[PDB]
């Protein structure tokens with residue numbers, strides 16, 4: 041088989057050599073402009089139109105968990121990927137654990153009031169504070185997918201009450217499952233901590249706005265791990281300033297890098313990470329891609345729903 | 351039976367009523383000065399000499415995990431507790447989980463470089479940083495007891511390499527056990543993170559000094575969860591200033607409250623909590639005390655070694 045690989049910043053030769061070892065019958069090459077030679081599979085991140093247009097590929101593997109970029113490119117350029125070509129994304133491949141690390145650390149940070157103790161330390165002021173209790177710290181996960189379920193699983197270990205929101209009902213024994221826009225208000229009413237693990241789709245853009253935030257309990261916390269477009273940043277800032285939201289830790293933003301003029305940078309209740317919550321682990325991605333191609337070849341169960349948008 | 355209770359700041363009537371429900375045959379009273387009436391068990395925190403002196407008690411229950419205070423008082427006042435009287439302390443009773451919450455949150459915080467991102471956020475500066483790897487983040491637990499083992503167990507969940515140090519060899523399958531002063535240098539050589547869960551005894555006072563810190567890997571982290579006397583604070587500050595130690599989170603100090611003149615308060619790589627790492631959970635302490643008395647009465651297995659000092 042023939043595999044073409046494109047990624048704008050990764051160690052390309054590293055990936056080619058790992059793919060060749062994992063798929064020893066494959067001829068793997070880096071795609072450059074002008075390469076119209078035959079290919080069976082394409083591995084891509086932010087590919088240019090010309091790399092895929094007209095190609096009757098057996099599959100395309102997008103090298104990320106999110107697919108809002110490629111799907112929006114395919115809508116602007118319908119000629120880019122034939123409907124006959126299945127599109128795959130990276131499910132977990134190590135990003136599950138990374139989301140768990142981030143969420144557990146920061147949920148515990150807030151639960152143990154390390155944010156309040158830091159404020160007090162800034163004034164060299166010693167004062168034990170009342171303990172918080174699990175019953176008042178229900179954690180709601182917006183998005184109940186590959187990453188949402190991993191984050192829910194790790195927080196259940198700590199015995200926090202847990203609820204999740206998605207389009208379809210979930211069956212996780214200790215997690216209350218809310219589904220659809222018609223159940224979102226009830227979902228939000230109890231979320232002391234709100235963790236966002238939704239995909240970017242037309243249906244979820246701007247969903248964390250003033251009406252959503254007002255339905256949370258007072259003194260809530262927001263952990264945005266998903267996409268910046270999900271949050272109306274001026275609405276979040278107003279809820280932080282009014283005390284509705286006690287703290288927000290944000291990995292993603294409407295414009296990235298976050299412009300220095302944004303009030304989020306210097307706001308005392310905001311913590312910023314520069315879109316680093318979960319990165320693809322190359323060796324796990326190669327194992328997942330190699331395994332998927334083998335299953336495709338054998339006609340076994342294994343994918344992105346372009347109509348659905350994620 | 352007769353139980354006398356003394357605690358200088360807890361909700362005394364709450365404890366008396368919970369002890370009466372858990373031990374319905376018991377007459378429970380708060381000890382005041384002048385009460386020389388008979389008693390079978392004493393429940394105490396920082397008791398005055400007069401409460402125990404001359405009393406042939408069946409047992410004394412110290413209402414804490416640490417016992418350096420009462421043991422030092424007994425050495426200064428040998429007449430206070432007859433050698434015939436067994437002394438018990440609170441083992442876990444909820445402090446296990448609290449130590450796990452603290453340690454897991456902060457270990458993950460450091461592993462994911464939230465301390466570096468915070469420094470960068472202070473300047474509104476956006477910059478992804480290289481990932482750290484588990485193989486470079488061995489965690490060493492100084493003290494391998496009730497709380498040490500719980501902290502080790504929770505960090506193994508995250509697949510960090512783990513080692514522990516104590517007087518006697520441990521058998522935890524995935525944790526390398528170092529024992530005695532003669533093995534401490536080898537123990538320390540690999541500790542990217544050093545977590546202190548030792549008791550305060552004459553043998554461990556000042557153990558985290560300049561010679562210990564210099565044996566750690568560069569860029570190490572210190573989490574002092576145990577006693578302030580374990581750390582020579584000026585030696586820690588010199589190791590922070592030289593870059594040997596990248597970060598220190600401290601819950602305890604040689605003088606408490608930490609005096610405002612201490613350079614630890616404003617040091618950029620130090621995080622301070624005001625001795626709040628793990629507090630006794632009253633209902634769990636009552637359950638443990640009630641269960642222990644029942645086992646004593648039935649002649650079953652169940653205690654502080656005064657000769658040993660912890």
Ligand SMILES: NC(=O)c1ccc[n+]([C@@H]2O[C@H](COP(=O)([O-])OP(=O)(O)OC[C@H]3O[C@@H](n4cnc5c(N)ncnc54)[C@H](OP(=O)(O)O)[C@@H]3O)[C@@H](O)[C@H]2O)c1
Nearest residue numbers: 105106183184185186187206207208239243265266317318
């Ligand atoms: N560094 C980073 O910040 C980083 C890294 C990786 C990924 N991510 C983000 O995390 C996202 C999730 O990854 P994943 O693998 O967990 O995705 P996934 O497996 O597709 O899960 C998506 C979840 O969102 C739900 N959802 C989608 N549209 C919805 C709507 N309109 N209403 C309610 N729920 C809806 C789905 O519900 P159903 O279960 O009913 O379908 C599903 O539970 C990605 O889209 C990406 O944006 C961020």
Ligand SMILES: NC(=O)c1ccc[n+]([C@@H]2O[C@H](COP(=O)([O-])OP(=O)(O)OC[C@H]3O[C@@H](n4cnc5c(N)ncnc54)[C@H](OP(=O)(O)O)[C@@H]3O)[C@@H](O)[C@H]2O)c1
Nearest residue numbers: 415416493494495496497516517518549553575576627628
């Ligand atoms: N808020 C707080 O900060 C807070 C709250 C509760 C407790 N604590 C602290 O945590 C301590 C530990 O509690 P615990 O219940 O885990 O105590 P523990 O069960 O008695 O464990 C003590 C451990 O320290 C080791 N040890 C004692 N002396 C030693 C020496 N000279 N060299 C090497 N190892 C030595 C013991 O080794 P062996 O196993 O060989 O005997 C044992 O593993 C308490 O003493 C207290 O100071 C702090």
